């Protein structure tokens with residue numbers, strides 16, 4: 001027969017995985033669904049081709065190590081990994097995962113959510129995030145397309161390529177745009193607030209077309225930052241820009257979302273706080289009155305131990321990273 005092919009991309013995952021169907025693609029990979037002839041279900045398969053770039057190698061290794069370590073209902077797992085039998089021949093890595101029927105990006109393009117579903121999705125996002133943060137990990141790229149949903153409204157967070165151990169513009173915290181890397185766990189909470197806003201209105205709350213436009217969108221709702229807000233390490237260009245702007249008035253949340261649950265808007269206000277030091281943390285968010293019908297501290301697992309990378313990944317040449325990826329994936333090879 002041959003390896004199957006999808007949109008030009010070779011998908012060399014047979015014979016176990018067949019009947020491929022395109023799901024989507026990114027800068028250095030493609031995601032398809034496939035039929036698994038061992039477990040007799042359809043699965044997701046992400047083809048990644050990262051080896052020409054140190055950055056892409058980092059992401060690939062980080063996602064693999066983190067997802068194989070993590071164990072939580074609201075976090076996607078890895079069931080299988082396919083790659084070449086020799087490192088010389090390995091140009092692609094195929095990561096096999098439970099197939100989810102859709103993502104929140106797609107869902108919000110087509111469906112108006114009930115307040116009860118918004119509440120339940122938010123709960124699951126934060127429940128998963130509680131586990132991530134308890135492992136001392138930052139996800140750093142939370143957004144609707146990284147929130148997977150199955151047929152019965154189960155939610156799983158995916159794509160941990162940008163994850164980092166502590167110590168997409170539209171969903172990026174202010175600190176990110178103010179700092180050349182100077183931020184914390186709170187950046188994830190900002191992203192979740194953006195996602196909550198988007199679930200309330202079916203449109204991105206801060207859809208900036210570029211960096212400056214993103215800052216202007218944020219201040220367009222929060223208003224000009226205070227002195228306290230600007231009492232931090234900030235990029236000089238960004239600080240000067242902000243100081244050059246006209247005054248902007250704060251827009252009350254109930255004016256932007258006139259039909260939203262008042263409790264939902266109270267939580268939204270605490271997540272979309274400019275100053276990350278005054279921004280609500282994940283446990284406090286779970287305990288917020290908006291989530292009272294789902295909050296269950298007896299059933300919200302945390303990680304057994306903090307997550308730790310054994311090597312300074314940023315320092316490693318991409319060739320060493322490829323060797324680590326070969327090693328991490330060896331356990332899925334026959335005869336291991």
Ligand SMILES: Cn1nccc1Nc1nccc(-c2ccn([C@H](CO)c3ccc(Cl)c(F)c3)c(=O)c2)n1
Nearest residue numbers: 024025026029030031044099100101102103158159
């Ligand atoms: C049917 N459908 N529609 C949307 C999602 C799904 N189902 C599904 N099921 C399991 C896993 C995944 C899935 C998707 C996207 N991603 C990231 C999203 O950022 C991703 C990284 C790299 C590249 Cl190249 C990519 F295209 C997507 C995952 O990691 C994992 N999706």
